[PDB]
Specification:
homodimer; Metallo-beta-lactamase, Chain A; 7 helices; binds chloride ion; binds zinc ion; zinc (chains A, B)
Chain lengths: 279, 279
């Protein structure tokens, strides 16, 4: 039983979000939804999410899951807004509590900020099975880009997050806190051991769908024949040349909260905190 | 007695800073010095200021004034860092207290944030005379870009801030809070009534020095013959098309403090506050 998958490209952040629909029912999940954010003005907008809401409404779907593949450093999540409009259960990999506990310190939030994942309604363990309607699904731990990345298998497909790019772009950076180029190399090996026909759906592109086959032989960074020590050297060498993602500091502190904005002050206004000279 | 003026271009922010030196002594002032700031990482760096420090050290100058022409929305000021290394008296126009009182509310700082200009050691009134060594100087109120802009006359020259651009670029936006396209029009008229040979030194360029003469007849936005109501219409029409300056929210909250970073938290880290959905 194969999922009905609709991709949604966001040109500002190069993010693909997905609606993952059970063909035998109206149940669906939403993967990596984007809350649009203008960092110069601090304006959040709902254009990308409204595309998702309209699709769900057109096809009269019931949102069962709001899935995050990892903690996004390049965009803010629109999960909370979609959850208000469409319902559904907010979910992420269990190792999100490592990112919460680390960045609670880096953002200086105190214990008014819980670091155990309560903001998310489900934390997936490695290998955990679950369903989207009748669809059969499993969550695999695939860390390396971040400590907490998950790949979601759903029928014949896999939502790999930032664990791979399209074969001609290669792989993503691993210099996020807790990221590990060698952990990512072995996460990719796990992905390559899947059936070569598995539909692979990327989180970013700089062109959303490939296969395990295409990747295994044609990925410019981790084709077959690229050993662990070679890849690591190149990954860390490219990472050193990379400036920090523009939205990283706003994105983490929203996304580590499940996509809740920071609390309102007596002002009536909510504020992000931008650590100075910490990175 | 004419000032010895050295210009310093910052390509990241298109800012001209100046060293204004009294030829008959070693006294100088520093105008609009830049603290380099990477907004993605929250990294401040001291490259631009180190150029100023080296010049002061080469020519064995004594910093008497650290002048700001206005509250900068496009860069953070390096006044406090220069003040530590070189000394000197930090100064700005008296109407800085309007910007402090407004943005103390917009940034929700409470009364742990004084709104009377104590962070600056001198607040210039309109028409106030002062000296840089033997040089004769006067501060004119020239609002419009911001409520608090000042033009500094020093001998035969004038540091106009963002009150004008070079004649072929025209004028700057007036949509900052308290800014007023019509106030700016009449500030410019005041500048045009100066002697046509007055050396005019811009704060930005997108090429630092022109004359009142060149401006009066050749400014593409406010040449002679452009009336008050025409200019205002065009200024507000262009302003509406403009996205907010990238660094505006970090820059104001540092510069409204005289260039002090926000306080250290028990973390040991300092934080900017970015209002959400307020602009
Ligand atoms: Cl597209
Ligand atoms: Cl459920
Ligand atoms: Cl130059
Ligand atoms: Cl003095
Ligand atoms: Zn990512
Ligand atoms: Zn300005």
């Amino acid at each position: 039983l194969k999922p009905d998958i609709t991709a949604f490209f966001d040109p500002a952040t190069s993010t693909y979000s997905y609606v993952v629909r059970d063909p035998s029912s109206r149940a669906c999940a939403i993967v990596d939804p984007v809350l649009d954010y203008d960092p110069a003005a601090g304006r959040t907008s709902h254009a990308s999410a409204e595309r998702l809401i309209a699709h769900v409404r057109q096809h009269d779907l019931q949102v069962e899951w709001l899935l995050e593949t990892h903690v996004h450093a390049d965009h803010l999540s629109a999960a909370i807004f979609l959850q208000r409009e469409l319902g559904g259960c907010l979910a992420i990999g269990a190792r999100i509590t490592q990112v919460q506990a680390k960045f609670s310190g880096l953002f200086n939030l105190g214990e008014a900020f819980p670091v155990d994942g309560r903001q998310f309604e489900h934390l997936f363990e490695d290998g955990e099975s679950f369903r989207i309607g009748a669809l059969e699904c499993r969550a695999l731990h695939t860390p390396g880009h971040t400590p907490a990345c998950m790949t979601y298998l759903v029928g014949d497909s896999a939502f790999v997050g930032d664990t791979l790019f399209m074969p001609d772009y290669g792989t993503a950076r691993c210099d996020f806190p807790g990221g590990d180029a060698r952990q990512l190399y072995r996460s990719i090996q796990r992905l390559f051991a899947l059936p070569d026909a598995t539909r692979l759906f990327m989180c970013h592109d700089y062109r959303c769908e490939t296969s395990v086959g295409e990747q295994r032989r044609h990925n410019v960074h981790v084709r077959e024949g690229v050993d662990e020590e070679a890849f690591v050297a190149m990954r860390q060498q490219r990472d050193a040349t990379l400036g920090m993602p523009t939205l990283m500091l706003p994105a983490i502190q929203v996304n580590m909260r499940g996509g809740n904005l920071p609390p309102v002050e007596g002002n009536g206004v909510r504020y992000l905190k931008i650590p100075l000279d910490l990175f």
